[PDB]
Amino acid sequence: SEAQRERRKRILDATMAIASKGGYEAVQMRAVADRADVAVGTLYRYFPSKVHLLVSALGREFSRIDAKTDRSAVAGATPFQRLNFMVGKLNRAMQRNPLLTEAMTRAYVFADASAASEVDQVEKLIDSMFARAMANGEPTEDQYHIARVISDVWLSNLLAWLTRRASATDVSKRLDLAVRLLIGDQ
Amino acid sequence: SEAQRERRKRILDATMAIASKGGYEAVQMRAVADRADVAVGTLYRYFPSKVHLLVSALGREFSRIDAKTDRSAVAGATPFQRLNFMVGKLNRAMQRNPLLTEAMTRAYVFADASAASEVDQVEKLIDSMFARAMANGEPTEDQYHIARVISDVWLSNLLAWLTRRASATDVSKRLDLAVRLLIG
């Protein structure tokens, strides 16, 4: 179904635009439908809530970040260094558009069971991103486990930063500390 | 002093009953005041928002667990086992009323600066419970560092449980993994 793919791409694109410009509160169903030039019935049909839309957009965004991140700087680096590199990249992406980030994060954590599959797919993505950041070929099971913990730390610090409980420097320091707590102070 | 504590207690009790019935979106200041048998003005004097309400309630849950902690019961256990026990207790407390937990968590994760004092109190409490569990006593700074990571994992897995991405068993297993990776 190429039509469903084009419509999906549009919906997610408009969601990204609206969230980027106005934040979580700006992401309204009919607004997104209108910026993507779609009908509200079809949008509610494919995405039953703003949470679903924002989490899906988050999914494609993580996937594309992963598929577009130039890793030349850490060619020949150790897994520790490469992991810190990836964490740094995601932190930069976090601090890029704070309204977009607040929107997608808020959708992630305010999600309920109805969006589970979506959220899970995001979680699995970020884990993978960290695991493969450590790996030579396919990650070890422990690299996946380490990535799981790193993703939890990253989530919690993202929440602290969004609510202004922590500064960017606090986030970097805590993530770095977590990494050193998991794979030693290298 | 005593009357104030009575009112505060009644208020948090009402908050938890309402939240247990209908979650975050059901917690309205007026209804809390009503159930609590207090004027809304008095309530606002005690707690400026439903966020302060729910985070204060969460903090009281964790206080009440913390007060019941006796290490003479877990004397023959290892740091790993004591930490996994503590995780078990916190998880039990949260897995009782899913809507209540959802309310307290929702309020806790995105509370603003105005509630920053309560949030801190909850966070420092959880950390201190994990760290002390590691030390079976007053912890080193490093054990607090580790506790902070464990609390991050715990919180993430609470969200996973709430959204039914993970069963209670899955949560236990993932926390077990985290603890193993951090302190073996």
Describe the structure.
- Two copies of one chain form a homodimer.
- The first copy, chain A, has 186 residues and is mostly helical.
- Chain A has one domain (1-186): Tetracycline Repressor, domain 2 (Orthogonal Bundle).
- In chain A, 76% of the residues lie in helices and 0% in strands.
- Chain A is built from nine helices and no strands.
- In chain A, helix 1 crosses helix 4 (50-68).
- The longest helix of chain A has 22 residues, at 141-162.
- The first copy, chain A, is globular.
- The termini of chain A are far apart.
- Chain A: Homodimer.
- Chain A: It comes from Mycobacterium tuberculosis (strain ATCC 25618 / H37Rv).
- Chain A: Residues 5-65 form the HTH tetR-type domain.
The two chains with the largest interface, and their residue counts, are: A-B, 32 and 31 residues
Number of spatially distinct domains of chain A = 1
Overall body shape of chain A: globular
Radius of gyration from the alpha-carbon trace of chain A, in angstroms: 17 Å
Q: What is the H/E order of chain A? A: HHHHHHHHH
**CATH homologous superfamily annotation of chain A:** Tetracycline Repressor, domain 2
PDB class: transcription regulator
Keywords: Transcriptional repressor, TetR family Transcriptional repressor, cholesterol catabolism, CoA thioester ligand, Structural Genomics, TB Structural Genomics Consortium, tbsgc, Transcription regulator
Assembly: dimeric
Entry title: Crystal structure of Mycobacterium tuberculosis KstR in complex with PEG
